[PDB]
Design a protein around this ligand. Structure first.
Ligand SMILES: OC1(c2cc(-c3ccccc3)[nH]n2)CCCC1
Ligand SMILES: OC1(c2cc(-c3ccccc3)[nH]n2)CCCC1
Lengths: 534, 534
């Protein structure tokens, strides 16, 4: 019985193989077969390459291997092209990801070097992306041992804390497979990925090939960088930070958390962006003052500006969902100099009606009756705080899983009057994911979050000041087909106020866009960021 | 008697003035005098410009002002050049900085616009740099009021919480000065900065002109973004983060804090870098496990790699001082792919002697006898923790202020045997700055920090593995003339191991480089970052 899987980097987790080059260089440059790729191996265990793979010398020290050849011949150039062409073998990583999800201890065992080239970042980025998905990364140059030497396999077994018979070992080199096999490990010679995965599938008894498209990488709260900024005495804002590049500020809706962006955080960071996933004022680890006025759009926007000020950021791309989407449009209208680009999921931009009170506007639409239920302080707090597990299980559901109506809420006397005491677990969320929201809401409750709805008149007066303005900065509107509150049609006239507005649309998607359709959200956002936000 | 100072942005805190352009455009393009600059003012209070300055419309909406002129004529281009040429009037900001340090309430009052141009970041950066140095920033487009209207001055007075006679008002426009003067405020017509400062000097009774060069901007701990990363169960690393751009990781020495970089943090962020000022393992808000082995170079370096991994950073420029400088050279030798560039202040790179034990090496040099005193667990902790204020006041001193010898420490039985109970406050530190270090050291004490010295044999064995390597990545060595422990001569042979090594040297500088000579440190580091780290 097996509980561990070991993968080689080159020719297994990363394709094309490092030595696929050479074979290609010799052929292309019409050089004698094997000359290059044998001069590279010169001296064997006492040679320059073994010293490099053991970490005795760096790649730049090794470049002068050194060793008729033409004028336009460079080992540096051949190796730069080879390392840069090498991309993650996605089906292989997907299989490793599946085995780990199924309880396996996963590891990368590779014959690698200490890269000190000017272009070393390319490989550093690749290793950073791969290493996060595995329990261990064993590099020859770090341990001072190499494949095929028997010592590295005994080291591998020690790190895994497993007997040889409990381990699968995948490698593209037969010589490096042999010591694993002779110790009693299950081995796979990797030629084409498909047959290697068929062999891995048969041995583990787990479906790896032709499996449904997996969900994007999520976040483990304890493995994140948590940031804290005091925006004013007694008001501190919490955020989760990941990646380098242009700052992308993610703003959640009601009754959410930074965790609502769990599928977007790794994806956007990987796309070349510095992600700042907020816990909005009144939520999670951010401060939750009791006063209603502390949650009016003007104060919330001013505090987001202070957040940028204190972090030393002149600009950030503002991506919002729900109430976050609303704030995000107001950041673009009142502080365009601080907004690099603006994007909203579900929340349209509707200019304020100066001739109609917001209470008149809300009463005119029956979908918005829950907003009137949210007006009286204490009422909705009591219902929502009564049973936190019930609250999140009832709300966080796909379009087909609906349990709550949202209509006639005030007349019925609550959101959960037609709802079960023990709602079933939605396909979008795990029990553990629900419990995270439960734990975050135990700190401050629903007073702060609900206060976002208690400034209708205040927000209306402030928004009326921007009635003569137009949003001329890069903007994106993402509509969700099955959002029965924030309907795609509500966005129809936005081009009148945002002429250069770009659009995205997600079919079979409910209100909880980020967790309902994570892959589609990431795809739309990355495409727009790369084209409009740099 | 005065306690408040108000400055205009244009033609006062920022030069050249916005309208210096036009006068220059008309002249250069041989257009009728005033045509441009009057068509701009068309309609007066009901005109397009007043609507813009009140925040009714954006700058891009205003561009089509609109209004024989040539083919190669563009208001967008004229305004882009004008805004980009405008730089901070450093002597004016320096004067504002002096008044605020002397107890004054400072404010910026400006007739400005909502900038939504593609090049809006330039101005956003300028405002971000200026606003941090003032109590208030009053923008016409945010308040819906403009200069010269009497309402903005009553608003100014309200925000300042001061009577007119307590306020100095500086402006380059006579019309906008008049309402402040007629209310009873002291006013200054700003033409040339020197006479304006002479007038400001006479009225306040504070020296503003020809004052000694001020210290760089420092950090107020409560105004910083504090980050926290768990590198392994029970080990969390704390850092202060400021700025955008390439990640610059600052590593302090013994017995320091992230705060030792207080003068570098704002400067490097302003230079276009993302500063991550660490609380090294065993210090401040970072975890301090008791075990000695937790502080060996191999573990500390591995944890710094995990820190980059969890933050989603493939690379960071590593700048270290003292023990931080040592770690930083080992990051370059063992993880070159994760180090964009490497810089050390005072700490030279000396390869390990494989034929001599580190205890033999330490005994051979009498300057290093304190390291032998630091060996026995509990001994140095007791002396250093006895009186924290005394510990920091005795250590943090300039080359001329020496109170401790560091020689014959073991024979004398301590670092402070020749030291006073109440040492005088060094010129480098304030009482408040000393108290910050006192408060940070109250959490974990000196066990963790001292354990950095308790791995001599372990560190020696690990360093011996890198003896065949060379540092080929961008590197900088900064020597301090009067550091009597980390002498500039100790660095003499570094070119043998780091061939492309760049150098910096600071005269009349002791061991505490960052606080001794902050201006010179910032200048050397920024110059090197911009040339070698991108
Ligand atoms: O959070 C809900 C919600 C979301 C909004 C909203 C308010 C303003 C703008 C956008 C959305 N209002 N209400 C969805 C589930 C139950 C209430
Ligand atoms: O912190 C001190 C110190 C600094 C170092 C050091 C150790 C290793 C490398 C560089 C410096 N060893 N000791 C300076 C004041 C009292 C001790």
């Amino acid at each position: 019985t097996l509980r561990a899987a070991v993968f080689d980097l080159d020719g297994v987790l990363a394709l094309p193989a490092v030595f696929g080059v050479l074979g290609r260089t010799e052929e292309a440059l019409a050089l004698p077969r094997g000359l290059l790729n044998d001069a590279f191996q010169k001296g064997g265990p006492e040679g320059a390459t073994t010293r490099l793979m053991k970490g005795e010398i760096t790649l730049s020290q090794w470049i002068p291997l050194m060793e008729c050849l033409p004028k336009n011949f460079s080992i540096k150039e051949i190796f730069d092209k080879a390392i840069s062409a090498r991309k993650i073998n996605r089906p292989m990583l997907q299989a490793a990801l599946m085995l780990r999800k199924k309880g396996f201890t996963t590891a990368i065992l590779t014959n690698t070097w200490l890269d000190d080239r000017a272009e070393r970042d390319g490989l550093a980025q690749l290793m950073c992306e791969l290493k996060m998905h595995f329990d261990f990364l064993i590099e020859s140059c770090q341990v001072g041992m190499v494949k095929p030497e028997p010592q590295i396999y005994k080291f591998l077994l020690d790190t895994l804390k497993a007997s040889p018979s409990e381990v699968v070992f995948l490698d593209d080199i037969g010589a490096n497979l042999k010591p694993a096999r002779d110790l009693g490990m299950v081995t796979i010679l990797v030629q084409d990925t498909d047959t290697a995965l068929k062999e891995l599938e048969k041995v583990t008894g787990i479906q790896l090939l032709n499996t449904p498209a997996p969900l994007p990488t999520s976040c483990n709260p304890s493995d994140m960088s948590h940031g804290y900024v005091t925006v004013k005495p007694r008001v501190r804002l919490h955020f989760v930070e990941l990646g380098s590049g242009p700052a992308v500020c993610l703003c959640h809706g009601f009754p959410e958390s930074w965790y609502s962006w769990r599928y977007q955080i790794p994806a956007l960071a990987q796309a070349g962006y510095r992600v700042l996933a907020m816990d909005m004022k009144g939520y999670g680890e951010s401060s939750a003052p009791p006063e209603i006025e502390e949650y009016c759009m003007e104060v919330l926007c001013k505090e987001m500006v202070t957040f940028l000020d204190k972090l030393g950021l002149s600009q950030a791309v503002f991506i919002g969902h729900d109430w976050g989407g609303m704030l995000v449009w107001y950041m673009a209208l009142f502080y365009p100099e601080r907004v690099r680009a603006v994007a909203s999921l579900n929340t349209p931009f509707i200019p304020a009606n100066p001739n109609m009170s917001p209470l008149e506007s809300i009463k005119a639409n029956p979908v918005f009756d829950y907003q009137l239920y949210f007006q009286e302080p204490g009422v909705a707090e009591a219902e929502l705080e009564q049973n936190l597990s019930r609250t999140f299980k009832s709300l966080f559901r796909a379009s087909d899983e609906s349990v709550l109506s949202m209509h006639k809420v005030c007349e019925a006397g609550g959101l959960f009057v037609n709802s079960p005491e023990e709602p079933s677990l939605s396909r979008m969320v795990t029990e553990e994911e629900i419990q995270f929201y439960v734990q975050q809401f135990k700190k401050s409750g629903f007073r702060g979050p609900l206060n976002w709805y208690r400034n209708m008149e205040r927000n209306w007066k402030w928004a009326c000041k921007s009635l003569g303005r137009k949003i001329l900065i890069p903007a994106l509107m993402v509509t969700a087909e099955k959002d029965f509150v924030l309907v795609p049609q509500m966005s129809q006239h936005m081009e009148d106020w945002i002429p250069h507005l770009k659009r995205g649309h997600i079919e079979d998607c409910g209100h909880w866009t980020q967790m309902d359709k994570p892959t589609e959200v990431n795809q739309i956002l990355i495409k727009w960021l790369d084209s409009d936000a740099r």
